[PDB]
Amino acid sequence: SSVPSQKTYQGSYGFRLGFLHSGTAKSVTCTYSPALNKMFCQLAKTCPVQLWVDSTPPPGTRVRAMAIYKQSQHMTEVVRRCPHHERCSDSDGLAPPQHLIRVEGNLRVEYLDDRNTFRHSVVVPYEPPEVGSDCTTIHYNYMCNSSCMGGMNRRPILTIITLEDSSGNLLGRNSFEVRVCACPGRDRRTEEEN
Amino acid sequence: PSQDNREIVMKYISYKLSQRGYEWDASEVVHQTLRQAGDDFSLRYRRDFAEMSSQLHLTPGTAYASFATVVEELFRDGVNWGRIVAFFEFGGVMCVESVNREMSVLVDNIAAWMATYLNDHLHTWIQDNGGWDAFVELY
Ligand SMILES: [Zn+2]
């Protein structure tokens, strides 16, 4: 019955989110606005979200992703894909067709159709940054447009990234708005001044 | 019944080994969509396959249990078509690497290993999830 919380929780490991320095172009498939805490992207294309951490979590930690609607009147409704894209044949073999968020390039990905919250989530095991770098990058996929009628119907959503342990207890939480669009650059600068 | 399943494995390995220069001797509607799915997975999950290939230290003395241990972790949270494709691809990946390390005899072992794990663990689920027909209907 309750709605997932969006409250920031850096926790005992200093869990913070990061995104690449991408600008408003036309050949831009993914760009994040620091001013609006909003990421703009197209359907089924790479969305790199890096996990910044001040102290490496222990082994067995998991990184979860969940979408909720931003407006208060729609927070109680599950974020699902539209019927067109659920019946559409774009499954990679690992993601169930109803899920909106996916993770590409990770064989250990798992998708949860929660039998009590009815809410979809994607979880991968946490791994410390690669040698030479300083953050863990996860590539997400949004398989439905924000404009997509019958699903979101132009309702803006948030993506909640949480750190959790073996049993799913909270270790960290961060969030950011996301819009799925055909032309992100034009749709970003349009909202970057209003 | 199982035999048909041994054909799926050896046909897969003889096809991927053949796109290299290695010739290896031990309808087609399902084998080609499986081989096409595997060629996809070798690019998507090259880091995972390299990690699985490092946990399995493939030597001539490598036993089936060391192979099933890595593959069982692949199906830890349940089996699906995506992870079955990665099962076929990881197997075909290992033979390609063993041929490249002057260990051509290890291919027959990997072929046999994939067959037994297929019949003992994946076959029961394949039959109740629409068979290989359903894998053609989607992928
Ligand atoms: Zn849609």
Numbering used by the authors:
A (entry chain A): 95 to 288
B (entry chain B): 7 to 32, 90 to 202
What did the original publication write about this model?
The tumor suppressor protein p53 triggers transcription-independent apoptosis through direct interactions with BCL-2 family proteins, but the molecular mechanism is not well understood. However, anti-apoptotic BCL-2 proteins antagonize the activity of pro-apoptotic proteins by canonically binding to and sequestering the BH3 domain of pro-apoptotic proteins through a large hydrophobic pocket (called the BH3-binding pocket). In this study, we present three crystal structures of p53-DBD in complex with the anti-apoptotic protein BCL-2 at resolutions of 2.3–2.7 Å. The structures show that two loops of p53-DBD penetrate directly into the BH3-binding pocket of BCL-2.
In particular, crystals of the three BCL-2#3-linker-p53-DBD fusion proteins were successfully optimized for X-ray diffraction, and determined at resolutions of 2.3–2.7 Å in the P 21 21 21 space group. This indicates that the modifications of BCL-2 have minimal influence on the complex structure. Two loops of p53, the loop linking strands S5 and S6 (S5-S6 loop) and the large loop L2, insert into the BH3-binding pocket of BCL-2#3 which is composed of BH1-3 domains. Two hydrophobic residues of p53, Leu188 and Leu201, penetrate deeply into the hydrophobic pocket of BCL-2 and interact with BCL-2 residues Phe104, Tyr108, Phe112, Met115 and Leu137. In comparison, p53 utilizes two flexible loops to form core hydrophobic interactions with BCL-2 at the corresponding P2-P3 pockets, while polar interactions are formed around the core.
